Design a protein around this ligand. Structure first.
Ligand SMILES: Cc1cc2nc3c(=O)[nH]c(=O)nc-3n(C[C@H](O)[C@H](O)[C@H](O)COP(=O)(O)OP(=O)(O)OC[C@H]3O[C@@H](n4cnc5c(N)ncnc54)[C@H](O)[C@@H]3O)c2cc1C
Ligand SMILES: Cc1cc2nc3c(=O)[nH]c(=O)nc-3n(C[C@H](O)[C@H](O)[C@H](O)COP(=O)(O)OP(=O)(O)OC[C@H]3O[C@@H](n4cnc5c(N)ncnc54)[C@H](O)[C@@H]3O)c2cc1C
Ligand SMILES: Cc1cc2nc3c(=O)[nH]c(=O)nc-3n(C[C@H](O)[C@H](O)[C@H](O)COP(=O)(O)OP(=O)(O)OC[C@H]3O[C@@H](n4cnc5c(N)ncnc54)[C@H](O)[C@@H]3O)c2cc1C
Ligand SMILES: Cc1cc2nc3c(=O)[nH]c(=O)nc-3n(C[C@H](O)[C@H](O)[C@H](O)COP(=O)(O)OP(=O)(O)OC[C@H]3O[C@@H](n4cnc5c(N)ncnc54)[C@H](O)[C@@H]3O)c2cc1C
Ligand SMILES: Cc1cc2nc3c(=O)[nH]c(=O)nc-3n(C[C@H](O)[C@H](O)[C@H](O)COP(=O)(O)OP(=O)(O)OC[C@H]3O[C@@H](n4cnc5c(N)ncnc54)[C@H](O)[C@@H]3O)c2cc1C
Ligand SMILES: Cc1cc2nc3c(=O)[nH]c(=O)nc-3n(C[C@H](O)[C@H](O)[C@H](O)COP(=O)(O)OP(=O)(O)OC[C@H]3O[C@@H](n4cnc5c(N)ncnc54)[C@H](O)[C@@H]3O)c2cc1C
Ligand SMILES: [Cl-]
Ligand SMILES: [Cl-]
Ligand SMILES: [Cl-]
Ligand SMILES: [Cl-]
Ligand SMILES: [Mg+2]
Ligand SMILES: [Mg+2]
Ligand SMILES: [Mg+2]
Ligand SMILES: [Mg+2]
Ligand SMILES: [Mg+2]
Ligand SMILES: [Mg+2]
Ligand SMILES: [Mg+2]
Ligand SMILES: [Mg+2]
Ligand SMILES: [Mg+2]
Ligand SMILES: [Mg+2]
Ligand SMILES: [Mg+2]
Ligand SMILES: [Mg+2]
Ligand SMILES: [Mg+2]
Ligand SMILES: [Mg+2]
Ligand SMILES: [Mg+2]
Ligand SMILES: [Mg+2]
Ligand SMILES: [Mg+2]
Ligand SMILES: [Mg+2]
Ligand SMILES: [Mg+2]
Ligand SMILES: [Mg+2]
Ligand SMILES: [Mg+2]
Ligand SMILES: [Mg+2]
Ligand SMILES: [Mg+2]
Ligand SMILES: [Mg+2]
Ligand code: NA
Ligand code: NA
Ligand code: NA
Ligand code: NA
Lengths: 61, 61, 61, 61, 61, 61, 61, 61, 61, 61, 61, 61
């Protein structure tokens, strides 16, 4: 069984980093993270901060 | 990092309330709720109860 | 078996009412209406009239 | 020919109001506004402020 | 209030089983599971293992 | 001309059956059913009953 | 209240005709047809026959 | 940089014309129109007038 | 088994022709072409050339 | 690099089989098939034959 | 009220830059740019130039 | 006529590279590659490898 969590990473360098950012939180706090699928991307402006929302996937048990 | 939870609120008054309803649960039980995005809305009939499913967003740490 | 009909309700008060409006037609004319799912919403302007298109669901037999 | 503008209204009462809000800006500043179609809805929390993003439509010439 | 979790079941018999598989995990670990909605389906090949990703829904409190 | 009806079949065995179920109602009550397209699938839990919503297509005249 | 029916027109000349084709059936058999929205288009080959599936809309009462 | 405008053309001959119609307005009033992408199509009935909504694209500066 | 290829036809007359255009290439080079489904349509401007992208379907063996 | 092919399998038993059916063609004729993702499902009626369209994925080189 | 404009940035380095590119045009010419949401990304080839289409958002008044 | 192929590139540096990766395979093996459109992006974890699935487009003849 996999499970997914919907996290948004933010970096002031790139979207790819913005992804890494969240994947790193999922990993700080869950074991067996298997993949992640990008569901959205945006830029905070209002430094400019890029965001990448990921469904992080992770094997149950 | 943000995180999201997929909750469905229900009110017998309106969709807006049906949203409030869930946002209030997310808040009962999580700190730093930042926003929420409506992903669906329906009406239970089978009183008539309106539903609004929200992705509730909330800042990690 | 359920069946669905694609109806658009209109109210000059709100979207929630605009939904009620149609759900009330489905009920005038069908027995066992079980639920309804919002598929769209708009505003006539050209009073301002709000619309909510619903797939109204109803149990066959 | 119609044209559309992508505006987000916000009210601290409801989504329907959040729609009205923007439709009122489109009207402050354009003639012949014909309709509007809801493309999204959210709630600012981080008072609670409801949003409704509309494609506002308006007849050219 | 309902809540949902995004789980992927896998069976080497069918998609329907692949669904059951996850619904059984949601139930091992949560009370009041009300329904589930299929959001995706795939086949691992690289025995052939069918997958069905479900949003499992479950009543809060 | 084809026409379509939006029906949901339910079986306690599988999604495929859940489809058959509705296609059988469309056929009980319409002549020339040509095809059907799956638009959704879910599981009632709250026995476990699988659902498959179909747009059933059928030739007019 | 509007209602919609999901019809597919076919012409061996064009998609636009393929639309007209169905809108003409909706009109043969319903009063107050208000508009129609194209939901799909295809070509039968297996003369070449173009199809346009429409949600035909029509005012109730 | 490109920019886009969301225009709806209408012709009483065809969808293709309904597209041309708007692309001609974009051109009346903007320089460097590069392409356009069809986002929707409908028929006014309530002569029969075909519509094609386009995102018209045009190079900035 | 069917298979599909993702081709874009272009004509300076219409979208329907733009479809024919590609369906004719699929046929130049494959046997048993069964149908085709329109996935997109656009206009080159930057004569005006209409495009229709098709998934062309064709029976394997 | 992966590559994908868009195939439709058909079985007169189930959707899962209808998937297997195509995955078996992809394998008859390509090496390293890694996975497959269901993009659609339908039933031929006009025996009843279930279909499952798959994007079959397969590692290049 | 927010408003949005649909711009496509292009860079020969990355998608993130391709985003920055447009966000910089929106800013050259509008005050209060609040955020931006990625709606598409592509690569011109026919140097290789990456594109990122953004809905740039900006507070009215 | 254009044609498209559905390829997934992977890089351990970024999504943009993950795109380049596949566009480079399409070019190794086809003449006249005109553009490419991003349809998905993910990260293998289970080094971290970023993926970008592209529809690579290429002019026939
Ligand atoms: C928007 C919406 C969609 C529904 N869809 C279905 C369906 O596909 N199949 C079905 O068997 N019943 C469905 N239900 C519930 C159904 O209407 C009856 O609540 C119940 O099955 C018995 O009466 C209780 N409840 C609230 N929301 C839901 C939900 N989404 N699903 C189930 N229970 C819910 C739905 C309800 C709503 C409000
Ligand atoms: C959400 C929405 C979308 C609309 N879209 C269009 C359009 O694309 N083209 C167009 O010519 N007119 C459209 N209309 C109606 C238009 O606004 C005017 O009602 C009418 O055409 C003459 O004034 C009456 N009415 C209510 N809903 C609709 C509807 N969806 N379409 C037509 N009439 C409706 C729309 C109205 C709404 C509320
Ligand atoms: C529906 C919605 C979605 C949001 N999404 C994000 C997000 O992805 N990333 C993010 O960093 N902040 C987002 N915000 C705003 C965020 O909630 C806080 O407003 C802000 O970033 C600092 O607190 C102010 N405001 C209103 N709508 C928006 C919006 N869509 N985006 C930004 N500001 C807005 C969103 C707000 C709403 C209402
Ligand atoms: C529906 C589906 C989609 C897949 N997509 C990819 C992909 O885009 N890129 C990729 O590198 N590998 C993917 N995989 C897994 C891949 O097929 C191999 O499992 C693995 O990468 C090494 O062999 C293990 N497993 C089960 N589901 C997945 C999944 N969705 N992603 C990863 N592992 C999974 C997918 C598997 C499935 C079943
Ligand atoms: C529907 C459509 C969308 C387009 N999108 C873009 C874009 O996002 N970015 C861009 O730089 N150019 C795009 N083009 C082509 C662009 O319009 C000019 O053809 C070219 O880039 C130089 O002039 C040649 N041609 C035909 N279709 C396409 C296509 N989809 N993409 C590229 N070339 C095509 C598009 C063309 C069409 C018809
Ligand atoms: C899911 C599905 C959708 C279909 N859609 C249409 C349609 O839009 N228009 C139409 O004229 N016929 C369609 N057909 C086929 C139609 O049902 C009859 O097969 C045929 O046209 C004559 O009888 C043979 N076959 C299997 N799948 C298809 C397919 N998708 N399209 C055509 N043949 C197929 C469809 C069949 C299926 C299974
Ligand atoms: Cl989710
Ligand atoms: Cl429908
Ligand atoms: Cl837009
Ligand atoms: Cl494809
Ligand atoms: Mg920096
Ligand atoms: Mg997002
Ligand atoms: Mg009340
Ligand atoms: Mg819902
Ligand atoms: Mg009033
Ligand atoms: Mg509507
Ligand atoms: Mg108040
Ligand atoms: Mg929005
Ligand atoms: Mg077995
Ligand atoms: Mg999945
Ligand atoms: Mg049983
Ligand atoms: Mg359903
Ligand atoms: Mg002819
Ligand atoms: Mg169709
Ligand atoms: Mg005429
Ligand atoms: Mg439209
Ligand atoms: Mg000409
Ligand atoms: Mg296209
Ligand atoms: Mg049998
Ligand atoms: Mg299909
Ligand atoms: Mg460089
Ligand atoms: Mg784009
Ligand atoms: Mg590295
Ligand atoms: Mg992918
Ligand atoms: Na989730
Ligand atoms: Na319908
Ligand atoms: Na716009
Ligand atoms: Na393909």
């Amino acid at each position: 069984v996999f499970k997914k969590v919907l996290l948004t990473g933010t970096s002031e360098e790139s979207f790819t980093a913005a992804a890494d950012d969240a994947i790193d939180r999922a990993e700080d706090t869950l074991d067996n993270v298997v993949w992640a699928e990008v569901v959205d991307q945006g830029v905070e402006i209002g430094e400019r901060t890029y965001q990448t929302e990921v469904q992080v996937a992770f094997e149950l048990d």
